Amino acid sequence: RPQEFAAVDLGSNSFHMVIARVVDGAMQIIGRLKQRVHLADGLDENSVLSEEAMTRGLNCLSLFAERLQGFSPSSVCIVGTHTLRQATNAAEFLKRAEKVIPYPIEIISGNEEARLIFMGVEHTQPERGRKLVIDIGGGSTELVIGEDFEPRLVESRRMGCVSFSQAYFPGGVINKENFQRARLAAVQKLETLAWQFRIQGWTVALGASGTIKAAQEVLVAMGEKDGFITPERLEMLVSELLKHKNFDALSLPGLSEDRKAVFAPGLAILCGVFDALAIKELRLSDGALREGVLYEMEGRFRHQDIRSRTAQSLANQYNIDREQARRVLETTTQMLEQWQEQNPKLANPHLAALLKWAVMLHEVGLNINHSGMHRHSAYILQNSDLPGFNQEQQMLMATLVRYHRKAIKLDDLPRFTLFRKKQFLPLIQLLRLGVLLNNQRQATTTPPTLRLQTEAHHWTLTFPHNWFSQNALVLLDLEKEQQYWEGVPEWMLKIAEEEP
Amino acid sequence: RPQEFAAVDLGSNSFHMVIARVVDGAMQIIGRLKQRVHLADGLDENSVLSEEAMTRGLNCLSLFAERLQGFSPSSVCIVGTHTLRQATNAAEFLKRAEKVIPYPIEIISGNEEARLIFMGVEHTQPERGRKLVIDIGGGSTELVIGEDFEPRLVESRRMGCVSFSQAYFPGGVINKENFQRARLAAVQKLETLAWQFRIQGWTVALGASGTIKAAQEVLVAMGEKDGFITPERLEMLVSELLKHKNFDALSLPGLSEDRKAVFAPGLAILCGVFDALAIKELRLSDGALREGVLYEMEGRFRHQDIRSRTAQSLANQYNIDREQARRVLETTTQMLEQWQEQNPKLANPHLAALLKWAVMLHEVGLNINHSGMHRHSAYILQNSDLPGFNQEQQMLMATLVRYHRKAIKLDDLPRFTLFRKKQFLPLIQLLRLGVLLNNQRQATTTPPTLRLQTEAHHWTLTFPHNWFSQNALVLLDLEKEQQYWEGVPEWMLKIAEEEP
Ligand SMILES: [K+]
Ligand SMILES: [K+]
Ligand SMILES: [K+]
Ligand SMILES: [K+]
Ligand SMILES: [K+]
Ligand SMILES: [K+]
Ligand SMILES: [K+]
Ligand SMILES: [K+]
Ligand SMILES: [Mg+2]
């Protein structure tokens, strides 16, 4: 039986339990239970947790305990974060919980919390290199810069969307002076770290938790479909926010009812983080504290390049013929480099990387069926949980694979928020030809030279002199592909041989 | 690297190559090449194969050879059938074939051909009992009775759709006298076996190859949706055929152009087989000679109940938690037996078995994602190649799994030729409840008693007295399921506890 374990996050807004089993190097989620306990809402001005909040929390823990019956304590990790760190009657809550759930609650430090969030990012997110990770919680904010599974700068500050609500927006009143007071308070807590962080720098800035997730959802709902948080987009958010007089009137697109009461103080802190660190683009990370517990503390997953780790896992799960993947990769890369030289304005290194991963993974669907494999592979790639690829990157890979066989219908293409069609359409063409030219698998006869010439979507592939006199089946398959391209307006595939 | 091999069938109508690898007890096709060589059309009245037909065959073999470059001879099995048995210059074709493909062609006897067709049926088809297997080819017809991977009676007769075309439909003329002569000629060839076969008997009659496939496709196109071939439906086929004067003029719904010129002689043989053996119902098998070569001669797959063999393969490929399947099976079965005793008219043992297999396989999609698992499992079950399940049975299993979580939309139900909605809808209700009551996996608390009362689609589940005092999470999930049933017209789920 595969190893199973549970990560339990007793946070400021929700109590959240995840149960997973480890199979072939993949973290397979097998259960998830969450309730919006709103524990942070129960902290009064003296940091005493109300009876009402403790009662909601204990009721949630009793449900978790029912689901964890029989689990070894070695397979359960329950962490309490800033709300339980901050509550002066935290011992009372733990006393009650001991009678309800038979696993100890580990109240972790802000340093430990920041490290766990970073580790969840490192185990799951696409971007490699130095990264800035921001998490604005209910009563604490964590900021980390690190790389290669190693935090370098680790900071936590006592500010969050709930604790700033009453302090700076008493009675839930929204005006520019309340907002600016909250925003300047956040900058002041970041004063002593701001330049240290800017000087370390980062390849990407990533955010986690409700406040940042809410900001991303409001922007997307307001038409900014890519979801990146930028200073200009924050300015628009603040302007729409300040058109409301109270939390009760808040009617922003994409703002959930759960987030209405904390969106203004959260947005103030987010603006202060941007002012302090001069962030230009912040992207929401879907991996955070719970993934740090699962991947690092419990699963002990390998510290290696995440996309490669995920690809190795998929090769085991899906019996990937590695020699087939490799010969397709070599052919596709040889043509890609010629296409790139001839079309430097279309060349995109991030898209080129995804084309190569799509080559590695294009046969994952072969265990379902040879018939329609391109669809079955795309189904797996689109719907799986793949560390190292966000949803757009997954959708792009799945799209390249989906289109690598049979009739090409460009009207069925997904809409991408970032990727431009002019830049990934030639990648479909390259994948189709690279797979085709290796479709005899280990029987493939690899041409010693292969020249690609492009004029818009008219492509000429030239093979050695007299090549096809020995490779009639390749030519039949290429002639079929020519008919497929003939079916795409403006496309044309020409096949040629070198002169003697 | 997994075991890999090629099965090559040099038949009367087409030359067909299949290449497959064996992974986790699954036959995974990875290559297929076929050409309609029409080798039997080159046999003259003296059974001499024309050089023109030989050249069509040599061209095809040269393409197969290109795809087989480097294959070990032990990994390639090429079989020749009646056309090469009957040809007086078969040795000439074999000598020429040495120039274009470096693997020997084994010309097999009619009895070995019959046994391989039977073994292909045994390894792939859902019907488990003693079976009659009929294969009407271009110049030979095979008839086998056997069970449990063991032929009991094996026979081949020199009659086929191509050989009977010239002999009884000279010039391609269609009239009742030509047809009757061919039909009686078929009966005459069967006189020496008919009594012996009748005495052995059969649970089911299965047919394979083009003639029988064409008959089924014409019946379906004419409105006989289940595609089963009966004496009454054959009489309709003859009456329609005899309204046409020649092969060129012949036009029937569902008859392809490739089959138009051999449909009348093939149908006459089929009618003669139905007469000689008193067949009342014949179903088309999609497994035959090539599957016998692949599954028996090359793969050497286990002689066991095919559905169980397939399920054990899927359990390995898809990491099925067997204890979870077991507890869901026990719960679903306890409720199924109560529903059956209360609805004996709706009870159906075939559908009941498909429910139990759906239980065993409902988590095959969990490796793709916990999120949407019911859709992912259905995707795998619907699109895989599953020995022991025909297309309709596969779609029924996939449909049960697809509907076992989340909103219930009966208007998206697939239409089945055989299975009636009123009979499988309660199977959806049973699987949903059986999975739900075990959704805490090994932490499940199994009620000592569980009573199901059905009044049409108004179901009452009664749990032990005060049961939910310690199973609050089960009650929450049942209350959600009650909301799901509220969304289906005339459905209602009631939850109760026994009196003290
Ligand atoms: K339980
Ligand atoms: K936080
Ligand atoms: K602080
Ligand atoms: K930035
Ligand atoms: K080759
Ligand atoms: K070769
Ligand atoms: K019968
Ligand atoms: K239990
Ligand atoms: Mg991902």
Residue numbers in the entry:
A (entry chain A), B (entry chain B): 9 to 508
Can you quote the paper on this entry?
The shorter α‐linker (AtPPX, KpPPX, and HpPPX) enabled the C‐terminal domain 3 to interact with domain 2 of the N‐terminal, while the longer α‐linkers (DrPPX, EcPPX, and AbPPX) facilitated the interaction of C‐terminal domain 3 with domain 1 and led to a relatively loose dimer formation. Furthermore, we compared the superposition of the protein structures.
Degradation of polyP into phosphate is involved in phosphorus cycling, and exopolyphosphatase (PPX) is the key enzyme for polyP degradation in bacteria. The PPX hydrolyzes and releases the Pi progressively from the linear polyP chain. Bacterial PPXs share conserved catalytic domains 1 and 2 belonging to the catalytic N‐domain, and most members of the PPX family contain two additional domains 3 and 4 in the C‐terminal.
